C-alpha cells in the first residue's frame, strides 16, 4: 500500500490513523526533509473533516502530543 492511500476513516480515531501513518512512513526510505514535508502535509490532508477542523485551530508549530490530545473526543 502507498503512503497517499493512507487516510482517516469517518469513525476512526486519529490515534489509530497516526499509527498507520508512521508505520507506512517507516517503509518509506526518502530524504528526511521530504519525510518532514510528508509529515506536515499529508497527515492533516487525509485526516477526517471533524478532526481536520480541530487541527486547523491548533495552527502551525504544533507537536504530536498536542495533536493527539487535540483530536481525542472526535
Amino acid at each position: 500500500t502507498s503512503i497517499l492511500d493512507i487516510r482517516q476513516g469517518p469513525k476512526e480515531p486519529f490515534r489509530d490513523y497516526v499509527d498507520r501513518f508512521y508505520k507506512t512512513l517507516r517503509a518509506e526510505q526518502a530524504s528526511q526533509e521530504v519525510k518532514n514535508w510528508m509529515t506536515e502535509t499529508l497527515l492533516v490532508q487525509n485526516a477526517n473533516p471533524d478532526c481536520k477542523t480541530i487541527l486547523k485551530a491548533l495552527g502551525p508549530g504544533a507537536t504530536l502530543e498536542e495533536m493527539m490530545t487535540a483530536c481525542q473526543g472526535v
Partner: protein
C-alpha cells in the same frame, strides 16, 4: 554491552537472544505501562548506544509513540550540542575526540569509539545520558498515554 571479563578488564560481549526476546515480550504485554521503565533500566545495564538503537529499532507497533520518542531523542541530542560547545582548536594526537549529541545517540560514533569513551580513564557515561533521554521521553509517553 560492555562487561568485565574474568582477566579483570572491560570487554564488549553481545546481548543474549532470550534477553532480546524478553525486551520484546515486555513491550508486547505491558505496552506503555510504568513498569516498563525499571524493566528497561535493568535490561539496559552495561548497554551501549548501539544496543539501545537496536532495542528501539526492533520495536513493532506503537509507531506514533516511537516517532514521539525519536523526536525527543533528537531534541535532547540538539540540547546536548547546545549546552556543550565543541572545544578549542584541533584534536590532540594523544587524545580522543569529545562526543556530540549524535555520538551519544550512537549515530555518528562507531562501537570501538563507544568502547573508547566508556573504558578509557576518566570514562564518560554516554549510556547514562542517552538513558535519561529515554526515561524522560518515556515519561512524555506515559503521561500522554494515560487515559
Amino acid at each position: 554491552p560492555i562487561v568485565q571479563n574474568l582477566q579483570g578488564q572491560m570487554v564488549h560481549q553481545a546481548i543474549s537472544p532470550r534477553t532480546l526476546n524478553a525486551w520484546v515480550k515486555v513491550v508486547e504485554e505491558k505496552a506503555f505501562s510504568p513498569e516498563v521503565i525499571p524493566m528497561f533500566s535493568a535490561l539496559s545495564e552495561g548497554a551501549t548506544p548501539q544496543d539501545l538503537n537496536t532495542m528501539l529499532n526492533t520495536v513493532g507497533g506503537h509507531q506514533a509513540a516511537m516517532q514521539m520518542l525519536k523526536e525527543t531523542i533528537n531534541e535532547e541530542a540538539a540540547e546536548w550540542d547546545r549546552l556543550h560547545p565543541v572545544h578549542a582548536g584541533p584534536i590532540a594526537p594523544g587524545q580522543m575526540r569529545e562526543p556530540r549529541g549524535s555520538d551519544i545517540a550512537g549515530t555518528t560514533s562507531t562501537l570501538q569509539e563507544q568502547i573508547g569513551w566508556m573504558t578509557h580513564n576518566p570514562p564518560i557515561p554516554v549510556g547514562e545520558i542517552y538513558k535519561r533521554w529515554i526515561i524522560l521521553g518515556l515519561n512524555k509517553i506515559v503521561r500522554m498515554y494515560s487515559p
